Amino acid sequence: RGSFVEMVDNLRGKSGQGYYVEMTVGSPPQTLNILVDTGSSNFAVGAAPHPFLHRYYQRQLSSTYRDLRKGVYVPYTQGKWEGELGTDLVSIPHGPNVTVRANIAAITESDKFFINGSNWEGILGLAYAEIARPDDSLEPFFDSLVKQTHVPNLFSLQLCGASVGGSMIIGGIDHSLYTGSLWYTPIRREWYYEVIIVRVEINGQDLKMDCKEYNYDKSIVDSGTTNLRLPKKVFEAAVASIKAASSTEKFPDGFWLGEQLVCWQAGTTPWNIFPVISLYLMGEVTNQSFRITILPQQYLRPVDCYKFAISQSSTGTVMGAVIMEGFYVVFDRARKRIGFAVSACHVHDEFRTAAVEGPFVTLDMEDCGYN
């Protein structure tokens, strides 16, 4: 408990391409790099020589592979894969010292799914069975891990942004990865890692929207998305504040829509003109909340050119890597809650830091949830 030196620094990645962990599948073990995704629930790996892939799962080499005799077709908004379901033995070399029999979707066809130039070749969905495809009887990897072993039912993520890196601590928390205290928000329902945002501030100024707007139709914590996505109305209000707060430089309108980059002469990005953004999350106690604060170092991504990485959503709020890179995030499944603490590795300057602060007094938090 509290100390997991073998798992520290077990994540890698490249700017814009996600954080992946090494895994082994089958017997003998085949090594694969697998993207860590708290926004989905399938363990799915390339299983055919797609040209973008460095490595892929060759089921014919595994004496422990078992076919489920069932296909799966998974369309997303942009992109899709299809695959054949089976189970095999899986382990995590820089992770707990166990092997589990897990479901694996062998991806045999895909479109706009793999990234040309990336170094991963599958995805580990860490969310709940309810959003698993094709349905919720396909048990997700972490559920299998916890049923078949004594690994406790929680994992934590420290994502260190830009070549990126971090730590996925499986079964525990490592205190050297954060400073100050962890603050917890309830998981509102076990499907995505759904949470409730109860107030939004831009440089300390409240957007003063009806808080149900903040969670329209859900808010989730998603390591498989780069941006902070905001419901359209909230995004509109939020941009108007940020634009106002930075109004000393003007940028194309296109910029704020993620449609154009902005560039400054190297080593001169004027961070100080851009405001901090705070989300207050529902706390553990009635009428109690706490607040996480991020910097422009988080929401202006380097591509010295930058992309504005807060964007409009039609799927609710998505607290992607733009939020998570500021914090150490604990997915405390056993107690249905998500903890945040300031990450010991987050990108900051000599004037401002990411922050997690409480308790605050917030009434009518239950009304913030959308039904």
Ligand X SMILES: N#Cc1ccc(C(=O)Nc2ccc(F)c([C@@]3(CF)N=C(N)OCC3(F)F)c2)nc1
**Residues catalogued as catalytic:** 37, 222
Find the binding residues for ligand X in span 25-64 (CB under 6 A).
37, 39-40
Closest residue to Na ion: CB criterion: 175
Find the binding residues for Na ion in span 156-215 (CB under 5 A).
175, 178
User: Choosing among Na ion, ligand X, none, which partner's interface includes residue 167 (Cβ < 5 to 8 Å by kind)?
Assistant: none
> Could you give the C-alpha distances from 216 to 198, 224, 230, 359, in angstroms and in order?
12, 20, 9, 25
> Could you give the C-alpha distances from 55 to 46, 79, 107, 122, 268, in angstroms and in order?
8, 21, 13, 10, 40
Angle at 49 between CA 43 and CA 54, to 5 degrees: 75
Comparing CB distances to ligand X, the nearer of 199 and 218 is 218
Query: Rounded CA gap, 213 and 232, in Å?
Result: 9
Query: Rounded CA gap, 258 and 264, in Å?
Result: 17
Query: Rounded CA gap, 145 and 333, in Å?
Result: 13
User: Choosing among ligand X, Na ion, none, which partner's interface includes residue 219 (Cβ < 5 to 8 Å by kind)?
Assistant: none
Find the binding residues for ligand X in span 266-325 (CB under 6 A).
321
C-alpha gyration radius of the chain:
20
User: Choosing among ligand X, Na ion, none, which partner's interface includes residue 65 (Cβ < 5 to 8 Å by kind)?
Assistant: none
User: Choosing among Na ion, ligand X, none, which partner's interface includes residue 175 (Cβ < 5 to 8 Å by kind)?
Assistant: Na ion
> Could you give the C-alpha distances from 89 to 18, 29, 101, 122, 146, in angstroms and in order?
25, 8, 5, 16, 14
Residue 171 C-beta: closest distance to ligand X, Å: 22
Residue 99 C-beta: closest distance to ligand X, Å: 25
For residue 271, the Cα-to-chain-centroid distance in whole angstroms is 24
Residue 170 C-beta: closest distance to Na ion, Å: 13
User: Choosing among ligand X, Na ion, none, which partner's interface includes residue 243 (Cβ < 5 to 8 Å by kind)?
Assistant: none
Instruction: Kindly state whether residue 113 participates in binding ligand X, applying the rule CB under 6 A.
Output: yes
Stretch that binds ligand X, among 193-201, 221-229, 230-238, 337-345 (CB under 6 A): 221-229
Angle at 348 between CA 193 and CA 182, to 5 degrees: 40
Kindly tell me which residue out of 8, 17, 29, 87 binds ligand X, with binding defined by CB under 6 A: 17
Q: State in Å, rounded, how far the first CA of the chain is from the last one.
A: 37
Instruction: Kindly state whether residue 55 participates in binding Na ion, applying the rule CB under 5 A.
Output: no
Phi, psi angles (nearest 5°) of residue 187: -75, 120
Stretch that binds ligand X, among 2-10, 15-23, 182-190, 305-313 (CB under 6 A): 15-23
Instruction: Kindly state whether residue 76 participates in binding ligand X, applying the rule CB under 6 A.
Output: yes
Footprint of ligand X (CB under 6 A): 16-18, 37, 39-40, 76, 79, 113, 115, 123, 222, 224-226, 321
